[PDB]
Design a protein around this nucleic acid. Structure first.
Lengths: 126, 124
DNA sequence: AGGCCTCCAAAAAAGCCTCCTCA
DNA sequence: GAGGAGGCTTTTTTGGAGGCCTT
């Protein structure tokens, strides 16, 4: 009954790279209200994030963030998963950033917490 | 806020919306703030042969010709890209001369150009 | 484990050109 | 002669694979 993956619509903004060592600097997490909440702060500090924001999604929270330096998805997932014994948690690289972020702000998805107000819509992390 | 480049001007701009026609003389609407900016950076991107700002209802239009010719679209990207605080309109110009003309005269005013005294007719 | 990288495939964007329809 | 639609080709921007290096 817990999500096996990200919600239907978001899926195409995301990376599917199964056989690949490319690293990147934008990521998303699907998890529980509380994990998100925690991670919000944890990741911010762990990865010196250049932006981050938390969102409503099917009575679940999604985390979305940009990093000053690149990382394997594997690596972010590894950091995330250790905070997490039973609660579900899915972590993926984002390909279409502005497109992802913007969709998490237009519903079903609404914002909750967020680093800069406005988000990508208001700053170019260029 | 304006929908488009003011009523009077339209007859000289392309309002084409399905064309791959490239061409080589263009325009832009913006707040003063977000306007003088491009006046420079366009030069060094697009290698321009002329350029001219204007006062346009306490706002700021922009005019220019290029050596090689371009998709309106492509320009409008290089512009939109650098600035999407505020706003920024942009079309290509079918009637080069007749544009510059009503721009440099009333109800408008030149605020700067790259050619001292700028372009007469001849030059087209 | 978790960063580095080039390489191409293939899509997206940004050119060239003729046209057809206005006049 | 315009000015646009759009067929077609050229150039640039992607992101998955996969091959390296450091501890």
């Amino acid at each position: 009954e817990d999500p096996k993956d990200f919600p239907s619509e978001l899926l195409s903004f995301l990376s599917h790279a199964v056989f690949s060592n490319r690293t990147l600097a934008c990521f998303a997490i699907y998890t529980t209200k509380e994990k998100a909440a925690l991670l919000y702060k944890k990741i911010m500090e762990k990865y010196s994030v250049t932006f981050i924001s938390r969102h409503n999604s099917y009575n679940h929270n999604i985390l979305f963030f940009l990093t000053p330096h690149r990382h394997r998805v594997s690596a972010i997932n590894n950091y995330a998963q250790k905070l997490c014994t039973f609660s579900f948690l899915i972590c993926k690289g984002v390909n279409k950033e502005y497109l992802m972020y913007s969709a998490l702000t237009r519903d079903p998805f609404s914002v909750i917490e967020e680093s800069l107000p406005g988000g990508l819509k208001e700053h170019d992390f260029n």
